[PDB]
Design a protein around this ligand. Sequence first.
Ligand code: AGS
Ligand code: AGS
Ligand code: MG
Lengths: 192, 338, 333, 123
Amino acid sequence: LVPMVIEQTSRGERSFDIYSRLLKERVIFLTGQVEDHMANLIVAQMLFLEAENPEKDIYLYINSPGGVITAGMSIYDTMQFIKPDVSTICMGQAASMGAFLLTAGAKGKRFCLPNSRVMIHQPLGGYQGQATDIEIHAREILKVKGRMNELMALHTGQSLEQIERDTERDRFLSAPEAVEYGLVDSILTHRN
Amino acid sequence: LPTPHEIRNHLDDYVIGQEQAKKVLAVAVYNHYKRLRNGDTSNGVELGKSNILLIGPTGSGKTLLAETLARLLDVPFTMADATTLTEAGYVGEDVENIIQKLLQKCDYDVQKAQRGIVYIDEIDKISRKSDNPSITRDVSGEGVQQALLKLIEGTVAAFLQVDTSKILFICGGAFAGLDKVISHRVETGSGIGFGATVKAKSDKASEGELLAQVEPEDLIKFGLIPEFIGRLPVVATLNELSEEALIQILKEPKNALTKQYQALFNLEGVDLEFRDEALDAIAKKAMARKTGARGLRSIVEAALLDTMYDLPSMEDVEKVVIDESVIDGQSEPLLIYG
Amino acid sequence: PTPHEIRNHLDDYVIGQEQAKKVLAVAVYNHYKRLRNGDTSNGVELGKSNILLIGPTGSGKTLLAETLARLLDVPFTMADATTLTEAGYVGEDVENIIQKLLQKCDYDVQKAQRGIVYIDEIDKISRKSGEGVQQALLKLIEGTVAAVPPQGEFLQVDTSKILFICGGAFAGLDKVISHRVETGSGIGFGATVKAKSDKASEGELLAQVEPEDLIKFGLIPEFIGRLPVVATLNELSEEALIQILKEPKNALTKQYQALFNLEGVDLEFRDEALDAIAKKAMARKTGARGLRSIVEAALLDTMYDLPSMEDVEKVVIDESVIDGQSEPLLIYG
Amino acid sequence: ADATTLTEAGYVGEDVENIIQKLLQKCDYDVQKAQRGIVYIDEIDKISRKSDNPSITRDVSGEGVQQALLKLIEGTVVDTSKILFICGGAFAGLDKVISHRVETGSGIGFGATVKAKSDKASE
Ligand SMILES: Nc1ncnc2c1ncn2[C@@H]1O[C@H](COP(=O)(O)OP(=O)(O)OP(O)(O)=S)[C@@H](O)[C@H]1O
Ligand SMILES: Nc1ncnc2c1ncn2[C@@H]1O[C@H](COP(=O)(O)OP(=O)(O)OP(O)(O)=S)[C@@H](O)[C@H]1O
Ligand SMILES: [Mg+2]
């Protein structure tokens, strides 16, 4: 069930849900495993907010263990294409594609909760078939791994070699460690 | 009798930053004088009456244009505010007295008064309004507009009967709120996809461009009766003074407020000078206020408020120097003792 | 004047709308011929025949009523229904406008009976208040002694002898008409999609209009009954606007040229330039209304400098001048 | 005097100035004796502005009446700067506003404040 909130305005009472009410304030949610259906929905929300106001910041809370890499790339392109700066805040956890999107936000606007956790790992795939087909798929996944590493180094500011070594295996970093690594900028502990 | 170039040259001596406004007004007024010179109008086609409408943002100088053109012309020129105009048979000032005001200014010269010009200011104030919460009888409103339309169209009414068909009529008044209807019609929707044109709210067409494109339906929706709009084929639209125009009006004019304060301090034997880097800073601040030329006086008054509060009390004062920092509030005005 | 004479004179000031001119001319001739018979020897009473005008915005519906009225010495007034005209909180009753018509006729009620009061934007009050205006306007359209008491003693004139012409730029009326007589779907492969920039058949479709169509549009049955005479106006095509520049007696080109002839300088507009102005006017969607503004602005630059310049015999405007590539060529002499 | 009969200046009906006029009738039209007099007003709560509906139209019978009273109540200009004024009226509904403030307790959950009508504060 989704609670229905009411917003008081001069025109009159308006009916909205919990998610819709926050969307009107330029807020987006990224919950559940990343896929084509959910990823497309997020992209649509970003486009709508840009048309309403191409200057106000668009928030996006990332809370998911990850999902399809291809689906996640669409969200990254939209964030870097729309003029409004996308502010990403990590809530709960952000692993696999979630971690990549966390560091993809506008510089100086990335935040995370004090107890949030971010995990980064190399791309996961796999193909079965003839030898020739397996070779093509192996090259494709390798190329995606290199591109992802370069993008990560661009935001976090670390060297390309450092990112590759740290992505060889799953790496768990707490909120304080994320700031030093470069994934996020500051930590939102209490409202001031 | 004066060519459009002559009126423009002498008109800019007082008004600044309105070259387009003076060009349209000069052409329309010049054409009317040509018809008056030779009223036979042998041509089959009868040119419509050339009535110029002065519409623009507050403080642009619409009333200033009316006064400046009066000096150049020798025909009688009387100014009447529509606020006092009311329906006949009431304590309010009758609208039929406007024509009389033109005769008195001409020394009762009815023969020479038929070629006069009358200007009306604050026309938007008499826009028809719903008489629901109004007083028992809406003396002021659509009644004044309809009565004026009688003379604009051309009728003989009284003294000696005077024909208003050939009497040039010029309208004025700053239409407050008309920019909302104009912007609503011209503005179009914006797409949401990647291949869509998205315009930021800050990067919105200035009010000057919106007024440059107007349609009769906008005036009718504002309150003006539809017949009144048709009678004014010429619509001279003004534009808000730009930053470059504000600085010019701040120094070039003989009665510039800058020199007004300088003479004010001369009473006690003190004088002040405004640095060039400070004149432009004052102009930009005035533009933010959106009050036109009137905002320049307020800005300088506040900046010099402290100077006038303690200068007379102090002794051994010779000169005062004000720069951009002083007006911006960063530091206090400089003063050299002597 | 007989209907034929009325048609000959009106076609000079306004061009096109052949069908609307035939129905409009007969309607005015039948109404006025009845009023002239004030004696009414025959016991049969003469009833008014209200006229209805339907056409796209900018087609000249208002110009047809005003121009036709000028042919006669009777007064003509106009009103707008967008303000919800009514004697109450709904708006401002048009009764005041009726008194204005009386004023034009030296404030004589006898002559005011021949009024041609016209109400524009009538389609804007269609029922979806909207229906309230129509209901209150039913009696006014027909005979009704009640009206604003004039102040010249208080009289009460009837609105039965004054002709009433209601006309508005109905939006979407062509869709309902097509769905009634014309066949075919509007969506699908087999649907007959009408090009927005081509195949301007809206005017022809409007001719096949019946009272049933107006009922669905929103107009109440009582209002439609009040208007027995119905007329239609076809949209002005790109070529039609070109003719309006020269064919009309008081055309824009003739007015500006005559003005320049006063100083001895004659300006001539070539056929190439006329079509250039018409094509851009259609894009602006302003119709014939914007033709005077665009043409004046094009020649405004040279008009201002014309009186000051010396040694001028006759100027000319080329097609490139309209586009701004060059300026009007001047022949020294 | 009656506050309901009063109305904003510039409209038909008795205005604020009429209040002093009635006082003159009681003081045989004597300026000296009028300055030392006292006035009373009844049904003052009837001219209260309708705060529920935002002010969009001139409330001649409401807000306008109070605005005009702001001058003569404390003294303005006949001068009314030396006559005591007493206002009285059976304010209806004022108890609801007071309760909504002092009580400041409501809700559905366990932490809410729910009490029977008997325990609720009386008017
Ligand atoms: N274009 C201008 N050039 C020079 N001085 C100007 C100009 N416009 C305004 N001023 C100055 O501003 C003073 C007052 O401005 P106004 O002409 O009264 O503005 P306004 O448009 O009449 O305001 P309204 O009538 O309330 S909308 C004039 O006396 C001038 O000193
Ligand atoms: N057939 C025509 N011949 C000549 N001029 C025309 C013709 N049709 C329109 N015009 C011109 O275009 C102007 C606008 O056309 P109209 O239909 O009269 O405007 P309108 O009827 O007031 O529009 P609405 O219904 O109020 S939105 C007229 O005032 C004429 O100057
Ligand atoms: Mg019209």
